[PDB]
């Protein structure tokens, strides 16, 4: 057939892999860290999506921001995102990443990671329960599952 | 020649998986990154299990100086070496040589 | 002496020598939003919600301190249920937070496993919380006056229900930890504190009562209908961190003493004063009544005034004592609210508890204090 | 009352010695964490099989803010103003005028879903049952932007959702 | 159920066992159907080059019986 | 047919190592209330092939090293020398006959040392550097231990050939006469290989791998999980020995094998079981702990033989 | 024996799902293979079921339809595809169907 057919394939099987293998990074600085640890707990149990507890910045696919990103705490953030290894997707948890939240108009809040990071998924709610956190997760899973890096390189 | 064929394939093998695995990822051609006081108790334990390390040399000959037949001797060596030994350990422990609380 | 900046929400700029740690700095701020100065341009009602945002795994009992404070202002009192279900949630909420408290700590110490189990459970208190408010942790339930809501009809069948069933799960949590050597030296003879100086630094809770301090706000200074329920405040002997995991631990066992009670001596009636310069009316009597109207006007738009004045109101929260210091200007608006998180003066006797102790020990230690940033910083 | 969790002093009588000298050297009480951990793996795991298995909720769950009609298509927004007054995180916009008819209704009612805190105050506060917190728990986006619902989206939302939100309402209404 | 993490520890039974029998099964392929002659002392190896030599071919597992005499 | 050999060796025991990953994540979420990987294929059977891709075509890491040639020599010294400990060990055959097996497989684990040391001096961070020198410090003082309590249970045996001790145990296991130096013998190749209560490299809040990530750091990963098993096959055969019976080769694998996964599975029972020392409580549960009672029993066995007439043959 | 029923529970699954076939649809596509009372289908092919013995939290579950409002749904299963009938029953809001 043709070659875009071809490297249409290669590109599913690393989609799927990346997908299957998410290893998130949690920044977890406020309350929603709580919803986030409940998506871990037996109910749930995110590990059995391929998605495991905790791993170390250098070894980590998504950064999942879960709290209120203050003055003080952002460039910390940066750093974190900087060192970590490519492909990255970053997760925004809760109305305080969003937007600030319950602390938009505060003098210390940084109102949105997305100020200071790009972000892929952002996630409503004030917490949002597990299971929207779960949801949230699985839609990043379809947006890698569209990915076409292989099909944009061909047509270069 | 068995021996040096098996250890040539092992560690060839893993020659080639950490070559391609420094190179496998260097394709995506990714955008560009564009980014002790000395303790002397570790060297204490370091010391202490090298002459104890050469203690044991002195040991591993044990499982055939039991065949001997001036058994009584060999006996009689074989548990003042370890006793000596122990005492090696005796010495270190009340010394404050194995404590870690500077 | 070795200088790390342990950084990230806490920074810890620690002075080693070798293994030993002879300064400990804690930097915080990391999680300051300026709570108290927000406070300022909300009425009464709309700075409810921020007090379940300050010790985030203990919202209604925190919920509880402002209400006390501003009903004190108020000169008002809640309903006799009100008050029920108000000990109740309090004691739903010390599970939570010594689960949390526990298993976390006994996490960073390696084990892994009773984190698992116990939140399971806190999935289960937290359909409670769901079921009373809508909102599975910030539910803004208690509020000056009672509470929003009643209970909905077979929430206290399922609350017995899991009270029977509690008990057994922190046996198989002790089976693990309690008697465990490797846990035990992880914890004995760590973080000692004296009685005299745990009162002069200002700690508050199991700190004390670890260190042998017979002291529980429940049974000193009452609040609700805390003076009606039989329960034991365990004291520690030792003062260490085995002590305090023990006094969390059997502080668990107390709060099922204290719901087994409050499930069968709930009272009827109301459930928030039955004021409607207070407390808003019912939305079918909203309705059909003029008054009922007006006054459903005004305290969603203006809220209703407090007259002015000062007080330090403080409850026992699970983390130790929790307060507020609320100012009144005779307005709708508090004029300053300054919070008193436990969590500050614990975290400041890091430095002290951490002398002679090793680089591990510290987690430890961070452990045993219970540490929250959401009200250390505020 | 208090009472004493470590103040028990151990038995120094010879059988009570060598019994501690057996779980020292024998490893009796690290066995028995073995045997705790050994039940669990014969139990049945409580995790649910999403997106195929829900968590439980209740009617009074507090999830995406919708708008709501009458039972005749009118809409039941009279523009108050008492939504934007009590909403503690400042998250709603309105501007009202007389319609066309010379009703009193919305020309803008805009939520900004990353400044609410989902607390429920606005449909506590309105008094024509306008504006209330549906059941829906599902409505991640990928830009910032969707998530600023202006009146056309929580129209569209009450459109949706009328079929749940009307018997949640029926389910809870005699509390509230 | 616990059972379903049997399939997992089935593969790491048949990935272990391999090694024992390929083993097993290639030194009686290489020595006429017989275990692998072990020599750890030199008298050991002198009677298999001894065997090396009466076997007429060049190999160690080739065995003469009562026919070569006489 | 010796190269097709090798390859029966190597293949199978990286596989092994491919779905270990699996079973631990399995078998740690059914004693944590959880199900484990059960997405990825059915009941997880495509996990571990998921991880190995998604690591494999990940960015590299390497930040500037002092001695970029020593941060290749790692990895490649300890996976060398992971599957070079696989040779000599009879199963029922082994595909190196040595007449001093056991020293050899004790003098290769000796020199998998390096592969932390080089691993901390190439990362260019001395705090890492503190992390691989007291990860060097355990691994070594807990080889005293190996060495004299394997030195015990040969002179019961009466050589250092792996393949004798099969005969050894052909009326009883080992464990019975041995089983105080197998308690110690178990826990000491938790912490000679680096796993929990003894994994303070893992110490997040309290490695010498951080530097890598991706790539190298699979490789590394291997040769860990690979000696997991390899320390559990020898304790099979050293405690546990297996009945021989040359005319059915096949039934000593099966059982011989059975043995060596249900150790491999106690790893991981372990972890799920315990919380972690600290460094200096793992350093006084050797020098003053064991190392006090393997003394006292090497001198035991040493003359037990002697004052019993049971003293082993040397051939 | 009860260890006898337990194997035969684990093919009635085989049977109850409507050969090999209908078996490994739902295990590829749900993880799931156990067989339930149907409560109901959907205008959009979702099929709702029960199983009372089960414990709370999986004593209800859904089998999306393989297409939905045009789109490909054989693989990619979505939450938000249950309409708000039955998002009620689905996530124990009410106990009427
Ligand atoms: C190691 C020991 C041998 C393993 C045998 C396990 C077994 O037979 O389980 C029966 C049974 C498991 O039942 P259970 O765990 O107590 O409770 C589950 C419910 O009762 C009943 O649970 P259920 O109603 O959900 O049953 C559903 C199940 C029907 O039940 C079974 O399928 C169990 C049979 C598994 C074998 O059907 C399935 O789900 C099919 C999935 C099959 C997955 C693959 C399992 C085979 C692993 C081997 C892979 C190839 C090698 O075992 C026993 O209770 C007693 C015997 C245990 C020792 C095994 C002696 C033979
Ligand atoms: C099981 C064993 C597991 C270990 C083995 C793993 C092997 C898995 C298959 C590898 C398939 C190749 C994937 C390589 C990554 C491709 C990629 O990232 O695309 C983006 C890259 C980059 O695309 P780009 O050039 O358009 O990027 C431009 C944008 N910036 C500037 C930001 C970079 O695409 C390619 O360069 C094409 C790679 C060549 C195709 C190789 C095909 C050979 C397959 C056999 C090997
Ligand atoms: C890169 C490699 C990194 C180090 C790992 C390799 C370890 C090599 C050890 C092999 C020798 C051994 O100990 O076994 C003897 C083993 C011990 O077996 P044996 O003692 O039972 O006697 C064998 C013969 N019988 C039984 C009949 C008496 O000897 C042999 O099996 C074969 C004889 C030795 C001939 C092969 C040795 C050639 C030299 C290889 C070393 C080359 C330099 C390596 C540089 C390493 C740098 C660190
Ligand atoms: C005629 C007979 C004459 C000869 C008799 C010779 C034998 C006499 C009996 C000797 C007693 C046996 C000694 C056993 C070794 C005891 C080690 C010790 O000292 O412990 C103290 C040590 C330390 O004890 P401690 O921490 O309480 O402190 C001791 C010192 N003081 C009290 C002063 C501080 O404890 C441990 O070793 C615990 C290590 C952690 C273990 C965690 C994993 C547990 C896994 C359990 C499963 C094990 C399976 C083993 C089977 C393997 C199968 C292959
Ligand atoms: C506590 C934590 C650590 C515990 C480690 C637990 C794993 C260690 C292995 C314990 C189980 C013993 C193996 C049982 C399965 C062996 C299957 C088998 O080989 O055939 C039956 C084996 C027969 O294999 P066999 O070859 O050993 O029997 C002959 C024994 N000799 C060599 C002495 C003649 O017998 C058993 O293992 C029965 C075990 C019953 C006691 C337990
Ligand atoms: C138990 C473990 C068995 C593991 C091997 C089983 C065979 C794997 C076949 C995988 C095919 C995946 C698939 O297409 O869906 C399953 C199929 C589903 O059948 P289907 O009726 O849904 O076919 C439609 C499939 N699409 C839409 C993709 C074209 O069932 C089979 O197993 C057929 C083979
Ligand atoms: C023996 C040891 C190996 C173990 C093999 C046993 C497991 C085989 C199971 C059968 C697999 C067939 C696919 C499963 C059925 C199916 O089609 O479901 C689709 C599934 C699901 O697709 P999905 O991810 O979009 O759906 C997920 C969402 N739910 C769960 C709701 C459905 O996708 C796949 O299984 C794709 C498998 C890709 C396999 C890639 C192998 C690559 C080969 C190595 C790399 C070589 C280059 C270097
Ligand atoms: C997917 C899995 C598919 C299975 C096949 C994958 C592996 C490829 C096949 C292995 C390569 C074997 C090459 C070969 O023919 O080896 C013959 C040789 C025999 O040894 P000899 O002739 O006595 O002397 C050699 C001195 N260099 O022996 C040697 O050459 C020594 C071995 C050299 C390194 C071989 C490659 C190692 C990596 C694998
Ligand atoms: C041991 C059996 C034994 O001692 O019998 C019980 C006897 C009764 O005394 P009781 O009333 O129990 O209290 C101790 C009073 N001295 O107890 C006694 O009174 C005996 C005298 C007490 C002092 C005996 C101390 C002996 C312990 C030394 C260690 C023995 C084990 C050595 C081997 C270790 C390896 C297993
Ligand atoms: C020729 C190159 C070699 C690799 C061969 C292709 C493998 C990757 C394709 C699957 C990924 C995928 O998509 O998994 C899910 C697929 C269906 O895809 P979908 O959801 O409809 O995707 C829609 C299109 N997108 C992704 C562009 C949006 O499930 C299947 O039915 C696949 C199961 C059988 C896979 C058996 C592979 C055997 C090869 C083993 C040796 C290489
Ligand atoms: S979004 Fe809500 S739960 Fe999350 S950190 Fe902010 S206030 Fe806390
Ligand atoms: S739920 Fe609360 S935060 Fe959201 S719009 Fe209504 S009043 Fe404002
Ligand atoms: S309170 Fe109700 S009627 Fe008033 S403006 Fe808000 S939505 Fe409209």
């Not at chain 2, 893993?14 to 260097?26: H, N």
């Not at chain 7, 939905?68 to 689905?90: A, C, I, Q």
Request: hydrophobic share 45%.
């Amino acid at each position: 057939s043709r070659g875009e057919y071809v490297v249409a394939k290669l590109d599913d099987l690393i989609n799927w892999a990346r997908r299957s293998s998410l290893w998130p990074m949690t920044f977890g600085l406020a309350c929603c860290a709580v919803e986030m640890m409940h998506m871990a707990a037996p109910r749930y149990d995110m590990d059995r999506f391929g998605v495991v507890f905790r791993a170390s910045p250098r070894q980590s696919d998504v950064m999942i921001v879960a709290g209120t990103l203050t003055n003080k705490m952002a460039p910390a953030l940066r750093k974190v995102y900087d060192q970590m290894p490519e492909p990255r997707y970053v997760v925004s948890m809760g109305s305080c990443a969003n937007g600030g939240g319950y602390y938009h108009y505060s003098y210390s809040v940084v109102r949105g990671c997305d100020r200071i990071v790009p972000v892929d998924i952002y996630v409503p709610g004030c917490p949002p329960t597990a299971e929207a956190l779960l949801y949230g997760i699985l839609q990043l899973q379809k947006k890698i599952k569209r990915e076409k890096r292989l099909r944009i390189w061909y047509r270069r | 020649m068995n021996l040096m064929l098996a250890l040539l394939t092992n560690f060839t093998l893993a020659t080639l998986l950490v070559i391609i695995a420094f190179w496998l990822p260097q394709l995506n051609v990714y955008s560009e990154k564009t980014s002790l006081p000395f303790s002397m108790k570790f060297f204490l334990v370091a010391i202490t299990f090298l002459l104890f390390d050469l203690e044991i040399a002195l040991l591993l000959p044990l499982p055939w100086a039991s065949q001997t037949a001036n058994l009584n001797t060999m006996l009689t060596m074989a548990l003042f070496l370890i006793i000596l030994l122990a005492v090696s350990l005796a010495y270190e422990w009340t010394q404050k040589g194995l404590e870690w609380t500077e | 002496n070795l200088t790390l900046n342990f950084g990230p929400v806490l920074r810890l700029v620690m002075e080693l020598s070798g293994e030993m740690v002879r300064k400990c700095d804690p930097h915080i701020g990391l999680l300051h939003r300026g709570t108290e100065k927000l406070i300022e341009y909300k009425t009464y009602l709309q700075a409810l919600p921020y007090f379940d945002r300050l010790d985030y795994v203990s919202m209604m009992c925190n919920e509880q301190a402002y209400s006390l404070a501003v009903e004190k202002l108020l000169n008002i009192r809640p309903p006799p249920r009100a008050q029920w279900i108000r000990v109740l949630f309090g004691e739903i909420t010390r599970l939570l937070n010594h689960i949390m408290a526990v298993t976390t700590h006994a996490l960073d110490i390696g084990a892994m496993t009773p984190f698992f189990w116990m939140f399971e459970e806190r999935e289960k208190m937290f359909e409670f919380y769901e079921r009373v408010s809508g909102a599975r942790m910030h539910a803004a339930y208690v509020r000056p006056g009672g509470v929003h809501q009643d209970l909905p009809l077979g929430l206290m069948d399922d609350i017995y229900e899991f009270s029977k069933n509690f008990s057994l799960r922190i046996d198989e949590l002790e089976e693990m930890l309690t008697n465990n050597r490797i846990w035990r030296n992880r914890t004995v003879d760590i973080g000692i504190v004296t009685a005299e100086d745990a009162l002069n630094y200002g700690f508050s809770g199991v700190m004390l009562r670890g260190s042998g301090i017979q002291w529980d706000l429940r049974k000193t200074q009452p609040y609700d209908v805390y003076d009606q329920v039989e329960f034991d405040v365990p004291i520690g002997s030792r003062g260490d961190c085995y002590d305090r995991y023990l006094c969390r631990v059997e502080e668990m066992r107390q709060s099922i003493r204290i719901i087994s009670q409050c499930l069968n001596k709930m009272p009827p009636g109301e459930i928030k004063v039955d004021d409607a310069k207070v407390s808003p009316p019912k939305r079918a009597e909203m309705k059909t009544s003029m008054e009922s109207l007006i006054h459903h006007f005004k305290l969603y738009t203006e809220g209703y005034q407090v007259p002015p004045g000062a007080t330090y109101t403080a409850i026992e929260a699970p983390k130790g004592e929790f307060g507020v210091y609320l100012v009144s200007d005779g307005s709708s608006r508090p004029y300053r609210c300054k919070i008193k998180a436990p969590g500050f003066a614990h975290l400041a006797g890091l430095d002290k508890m951490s002398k002679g102790h090793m680089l591990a020990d510290v987690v430890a230690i961070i452990g045993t204090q219970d540490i929250v940033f959401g009200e250390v910083d505020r | 009352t208090y009472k004493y969790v470590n103040l028990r002093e151990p038995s120094m009588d010879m059988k009570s010695v060598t019994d501690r000298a057996a779980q020292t050297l024998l490893w009796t009480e690290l066995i028995r964490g073995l045997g705790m951990t050994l039940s669990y793996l014969f139990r049945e795991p409580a995790t649910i099989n999403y997106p195929f298995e829900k968590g439980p909720l209740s009617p009074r769950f507090r999830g995406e803010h919708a708008l709501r009609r009458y039972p005749s298509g009118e809409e039941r927004c009279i523009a108050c103003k008492l939504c934007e007054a009590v909403c503690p995180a400042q998250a709603i916009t309105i501007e009202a005028e007389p319609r066309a008819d010379g009703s009193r209704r919305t020309t803008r009612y805009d939520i900004d879903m990353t400044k609410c805190i989902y607390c429920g105050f606005c449909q506590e506060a309105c008094p024509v049952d306008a504006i209330v917190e549906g059941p829906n728990f599902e409505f991640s986006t990928e830009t910032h932007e969707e998530l600023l619902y202006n009146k056309e989206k929580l129209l569209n939302n009450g459109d949706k959702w009328e079929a749940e939100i009307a018997a949640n309402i029926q389910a809870d209404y005699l509390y509230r | 159920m616990w059972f379903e993490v049997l399939p997992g520890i089935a593969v790491m039974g048949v990935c272990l066992f391999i090694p024992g029998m390929a083993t097993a099964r290639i030194h009686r392929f290489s020595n006429g159907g017989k275990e692998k002659r072990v020599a750890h002392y030199p008298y050991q190896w002198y009677l298999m080059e001894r065997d090396r030599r009466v076997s007429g071919v060049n190999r160690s597992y080739v065995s003469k019986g009562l026919e070569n005499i006489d | 047919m010796f190269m097709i050999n090798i390859l029966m060796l190597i293949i199978p025991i990286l596989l092994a190592v491919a779905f270990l990953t699996l079973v631990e994540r399995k078998v740690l979420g059914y004693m944590q209330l959880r199900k484990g990987p059960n997405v990825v294929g059915p009941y997880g059977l495509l996990q571990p092939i998921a991880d190995a891709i998604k690591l494999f075509i990940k960015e590299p890491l390497r930040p500037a090293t002092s001695s970029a040639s020593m941060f290749i020599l790692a990895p490649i010294m300890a996976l060398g020398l992971a599957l070079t400990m696989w040779i000599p060990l009879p199963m029922p055959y082994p595909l190196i006959n040595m007449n001093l097996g056991v020293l050899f497989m004790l003098a290769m684990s000796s020199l998998a040392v390096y592969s932390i040391l080089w691993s901390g001096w190439a990362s260019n961070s001395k705090y890492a550097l503190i992390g691989a020198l007291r990860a060097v410090a355990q691994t070594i003082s807990y080889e005293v231990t190996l060495a004299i309590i394997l030195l015990s249970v040969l002179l019961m045996s009466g050589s250092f050939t792996l393949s004798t001790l099969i005969t050894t145990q052909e009326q009883m296991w080992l464990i019975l006469p041995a089983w105080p130096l197998a308690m110690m013998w178990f826990i000491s190749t938790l912490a000679e290989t680096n796993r929990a209560p003894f994994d303070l490299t893992e110490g997040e809040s309290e490695g010498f791998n951080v530097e890598y990530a991706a790539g190298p750091f699979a490789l590394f990963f291997m040769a860990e999980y690979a000696n997991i098993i390899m320390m559990n096959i020898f304790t099979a055969i050293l405690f546990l020995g297996t009945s021989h019976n040359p005319h059915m080769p096949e039934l000593y694998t099966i059982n011989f094998t059975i043995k060596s996964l249900l150790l491999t599975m106690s790893f991981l029972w372990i972890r799920a079981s315990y919380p972690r020392f600290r460094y200096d409580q793992l350093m006084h549960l050797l020098w003053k702990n064991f190392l006090p009672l393997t003394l006292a029993l090497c001198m035991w066995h040493v003359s037990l033989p002697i004052l019993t007439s049971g003293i082993p043959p040397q051939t | 024996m009860e260890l006898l029923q337990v194997l035969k529970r684990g093919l009635q699954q085989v049977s109850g799902h409507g050969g090999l076939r209908g078996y490994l649809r739902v295990l590829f596509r749900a993880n799931d293979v156990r067989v339930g009372t149907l409560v109901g289908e959907d205008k959009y092919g979702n099929k709702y079921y029960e199983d009372n013995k089960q414990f709370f939290g999986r004593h209800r579950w859904v089998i999306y339809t393989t297409e939905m409002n045009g789109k490909n749904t054989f693989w990619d299963v979505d939450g938000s595809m249950v309409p708000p009938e039955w998002h009620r029953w689905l996530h124990c809001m009410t106990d009427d169907p």
